[PDB]
Amino acid sequence: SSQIRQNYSTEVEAAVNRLVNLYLRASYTYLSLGFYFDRDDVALEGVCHFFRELAEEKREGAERLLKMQNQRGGRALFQDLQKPSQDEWGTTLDAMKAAIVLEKSLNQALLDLHALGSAQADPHLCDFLESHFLDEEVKLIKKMGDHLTNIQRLVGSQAGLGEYLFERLTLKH
Amino acid sequence: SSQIRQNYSTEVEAAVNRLVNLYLRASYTYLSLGFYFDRDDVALEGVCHFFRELAEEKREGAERLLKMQNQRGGRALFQDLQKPSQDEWGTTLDAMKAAIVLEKSLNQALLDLHALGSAQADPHLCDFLESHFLDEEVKLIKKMGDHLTNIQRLVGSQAGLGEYLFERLTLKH
Amino acid sequence: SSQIRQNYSTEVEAAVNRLVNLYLRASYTYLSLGFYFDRDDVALEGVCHFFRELAEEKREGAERLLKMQNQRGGRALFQDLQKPSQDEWGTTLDAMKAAIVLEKSLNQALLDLHALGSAQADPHLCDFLESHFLDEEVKLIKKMGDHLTNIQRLVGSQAGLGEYLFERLTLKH
Amino acid sequence: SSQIRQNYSTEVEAAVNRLVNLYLRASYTYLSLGFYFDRDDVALEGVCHFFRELAEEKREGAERLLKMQNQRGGRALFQDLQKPSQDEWGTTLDAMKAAIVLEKSLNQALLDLHALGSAQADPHLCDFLESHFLDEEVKLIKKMGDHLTNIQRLVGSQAGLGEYLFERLTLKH
Amino acid sequence: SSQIRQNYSTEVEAAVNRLVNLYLRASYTYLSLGFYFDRDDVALEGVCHFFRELAEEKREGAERLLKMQNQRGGRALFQDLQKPSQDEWGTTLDAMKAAIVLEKSLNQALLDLHALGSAQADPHLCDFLESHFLDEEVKLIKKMGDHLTNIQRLVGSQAGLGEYLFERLTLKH
Amino acid sequence: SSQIRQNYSTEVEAAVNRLVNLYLRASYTYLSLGFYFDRDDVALEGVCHFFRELAEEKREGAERLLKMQNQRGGRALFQDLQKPSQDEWGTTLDAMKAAIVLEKSLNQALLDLHALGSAQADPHLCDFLESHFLDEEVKLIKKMGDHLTNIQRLVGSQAGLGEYLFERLTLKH
Ligand SMILES: [Cl-]
Ligand SMILES: [Cl-]
Ligand SMILES: [Cl-]
Ligand SMILES: [Cl-]
Ligand SMILES: [Cl-]
Ligand SMILES: [Cl-]
C-alpha cells in the first residue's frame, strides 16, 4: 500500500507481476518435462529429477518476487497460467534444447526488468535482481550448455546407448 | 504406456488429469490468499502462513496424482490454469469461508472419482484415494470448520481486535 | 588522504558526512522514543525495546558510513546533532507513524546519495549502499507498515486494551 | 511521573538531564577521536580501538542515567549535542591530553551532582553515582595518566618510532 | 560459445581478456617482490609473506575472471606476460609505494570495465565486479595506505631499526 | 648474496633462472588447457580439473626453485612469460599428446641441469633435483602415457562416446 511505497513505479509493479507469471509458467513447463521422463516408455530417472528440481527452483523464484512486491508496497495480481508448449518432449537432447530456450527467455525478461529499473532510478529493484536472479540464471544456462554438448557428443555416436550413459553418469539419481 | 497398463480405463485416466488441474488451481488460489495476508495493509502473518502451507499441500497432492498416473501407464496431460476467483480476499472470515468452499469442491471431485473407480472396478484407484486423499480432506475441512467457528465468535464481539487475537493465539507464526 | 583516494568525488564525500549526521540524529530520536515508553506513566516495555534496538541499528549504520569514508580516503566531519523533534511521543500509534516518516526520510537520503554516485560513476559507493543499506531499509519500512496496520486495527476497537495487546503479543519483551 | 516520585528534587532532575547531555557529547567526541586514528594518513589501530571503546562506555553511562531518571519518576529531556571541539586531533599525545581534560570535566560534573544530592538529602542519587560512576572515572583517569606518562617518555626520545611502539606494545589491537 | 551467450558484447569479452592479463602480471610482480624480501641480504620474512599472499590473491582474481568468461560464453585468449618492472625493489617503503601504484592501476582497469559494462547494459558483469573485485580492492588499498604511513613514521626516525620493527610488529610471520 | 654463497656457479644460477621460466610457462599452458575444457562447447569437467591441478603443480615447482635459488645465495631474475603455443587444444587426445610433449621438454631441462651440476661438482643441486623433481616427473609422464593409451583405445572405437567415458570413469570430477 501507499503507507510504505516509496520510489516504486507503476511500470515496475506491473512488470514484476508479469515476471511472476513467466516464472510460474516455467515451473509448470518443468513439471511437465519431469513427469514425461518418468513415463514407463521413457524412463530416465536422472532426467526426471533434473527437471523436477528446476520446477521447484522456478516456483521459489516466483515466491521471492511476490515477497519483494509486498515489501515495496506493490500489489500482486495473478493471471491465467498457460499450459506448456508441448505434451511430449522427445529425447533428452530435444528436452535440453527446449529448456535452454526457455531459460534464455527468462533471462531476457530479467534483463528487460533490470533496464526498466535503471531507467526509473530504482536501485533496490536492480540490486534485488542482481543478487537473487541474474547470476543464478547465468550459472544455470552454462550448466545446460555443458549438458547439451555432452548429450550431443554421446547421441552422435549411438543414440540409445548415449542417452542412457548421460542419465547414469552425469545426472543425479 | 501400453506395456504396463492393466485395468486402467480411459475415463479414469482423463478424470485423473482433470483432478490434477483442480489441485494445481487450488494451490494457485492458496498462493494468492497467502500473499494477500502478507500485504502491509492486511498484515496477518499467521493467516499468510496457513494459506502458504495449504498451497504447498495442494501442489504435493497434484504431484502424487501425476506419479500415480505414470505408475498405472496413463499419460499426464496439462491444461491452462485458471487464475484465482478474486484478487483481494477480504477479512480472515471471508478468506476462511472461501477456503472451505474450495475444499468442499475438491472433496466432491475426489468422491466423484472414487465413484467412477468403483463403477469401473478399479480397486487400486479407490484405495489410492482412500489412503492418500479422502481422510486428509475430511481432517482439513474439520480444522477449517473449527477455525470458522472461532473467527465468528471473535469478530461478532469486536472485529479488528478479534481478528488479531485469532491470528496471534490460534494460528502458527 | 590523497595517498589512497581514487574516483571519490568531493560531492560524495560531503554527502556521506551529511548522511552520517542524519543517521546519528535518527539514533538520537530512537533513544528518546525508547525512554519515553519506559516512563512509569507509559510503561510499554516491548515498545521501549523496539525503539532502543533501532537506536543501536542507526548508530551502527553511521559507524559503517564513517568506516567507508576512511576506506575511500575521505575525511569525516562532524556537525551538531539536533535534538529530536518532540519531547513526548503520544501513543504507540503516534510513535510508529513518526518512526515510519523518519525512515522514509532516511530512505530518500539513501536514494539521493545513490543517484549522486551513479551520476559521478562511483560504483563502489553505489554497491556499498545497495549491499548494506537499501534492502535493510525496505525490510524495516515493511515491518513498520505491518505494525501500523495491526496497531490501527486494535486501537480502533478499544484503545487501551488494544495497545496493551500489541505490546504483549507482537513486540518482543 | 508523580505516581512514583519520592524525594526527587527538580534541581536533581534537571542536573541529571544535563549530565546525560555531557555523557553523550563525550561519546561523540570519542567517536571523532576514534575515526581520526583510523585515517590512512594517521593509521594507529590500537589508538582508534581505545577511543571507540570509550565512545561506547560513555554512551552506556548516558543510558544508565536515563534509566535512573525514569526509575525515580523524573522526565528525560534531550538537548542538541554540540559537535566535538576539534576536527583533527594531532598526535597520540595531543589526543590523550584532550581525553584526560574531557574526563576531568566529566568527573567534576559527577562531583557537583553528588554535592547537590548530598545537600538535597537524596541518598539514592548519591549511592547511584558512587556505585556506577565515581570509581569508574577514577580508574579511567589513572589509566589515561599512566598512558600519558608512557607516551611522553617515548616521543621525547624519538617521536614517530615512539608513537608506533606505544600503539603496538601498550594498546590492544 | 554461441549456444549460451546472451547480452555479452565483444568489447566486454576483449576487455575481460585484457584484465586477466593485468591480474596475472600483477601476480608475477608480487612473486618477484616476495622473493626479493627472502634474499639473505634483505631478509624481511613478514614482507616476503605479505607479497607472496598478494601473488596468490591476484592469481585467484584472474582465475575468477576466466571462470566468468566461460560462464558468459566468451573465449579466453592468453597473451605474453610482461616481466615485472624492476629486478630489485629497494626498501620496504619503496616496495609498498610500488605496490600501491600497481593496485591503483588495477583499480582503474576495474572501474573502466565497470563503465564499459554500464554503457553496454550488462548488469551481470557490473554486479560481478562489484561483488568480487571493487570492495576487495578498496580494502586492500586502504591497508596499503595504512602500512605506508606506519613505515614512513618509522624510517623517518631511524631507517634500519624502523624497517625491522615494522616487519616484526605489524606484518605476520 | 656473497655472504652465504658457496660452491654455487654462475652457470647453475643462470640455468635455475631459466628453469623457473620454463616451469612458469608450463603452468600457464596448463591454465589455458584447463579453461579450454571448461568451455560450454567442450565441457569435460574431469579434463579441466586434471590440467588445473597440473598448473598448480608446475607453479609450485617454480616456487621451490626460487626458494632454492635464495637458499644458495643466487639472485632470481624474471623474464617475460611466453603465451601458450595454441589458443584451442582440440580433443582430449590432442591435449594429452601436447601435455606429454611439454613434460618431456621439462624433463630434458631437468636432466640437462643435473648434468651441469654434476660437471660443476654441485651435489646439493643434484640432490635437490633428484629429491624434488626427477621422480615426480617420471611418475607424471607414466600416468600421462597410461591415459594416452586408454584414450586411444576408446576413441578408436567411437570418438565422442569414448571421450565422455574416459572423462567420467578415469578422471576425477
Ligand atoms: Cl481471466
Ligand atoms: Cl490451450
Ligand atoms: Cl558548531
Ligand atoms: Cl533546539
Ligand atoms: Cl606472441
Ligand atoms: Cl623485457
UniProtKB/Swiss-Prot annotation, chains A, B, C, D, E, F:
Give all N-acetylserine modified positions: S1
Q: Main localisation, per the record?
A: cytoplasm
Q: Which gene encodes it?
A: FTL
Q: What is the lineage of its organism?
A: Eukaryota, Metazoa, Chordata, Craniata, Vertebrata
Keyword Ribosomal protein part of the UniProt annotation: no
UniProt keyword annotations, A-Z:
Acetylation, Cytoplasm, Cytoplasmic vesicle, Iron, Iron storage, Lysosome, Metal-binding
Q: Where does Fe cation bind?
A: E53, E56, E57, E60, E63
Is Acetylation set as a keyword in this record? yes
GO CC, one annotated term: ferritin complex
What is the similarity comment for this entry?
Belongs to the ferritin family.
- How does it associate, per the subunit comment? Oligomer of 24 subunits. There are two types of subunits: L (light) chain and H (heavy) chain. The major chain can be light or heavy, depending on the species and tissue type. The functional molecule forms a roughly spherical shell with a diameter of 12 nm and contains a central cavity into which the insoluble mineral iron core is deposited. Interacts with NCOA4.
Protein's recorded name: Ferritin light chain
Q: What else is known?
A: In horse spleen the light chain is the major chain.
Species of origin: Equus caballus (Horse)
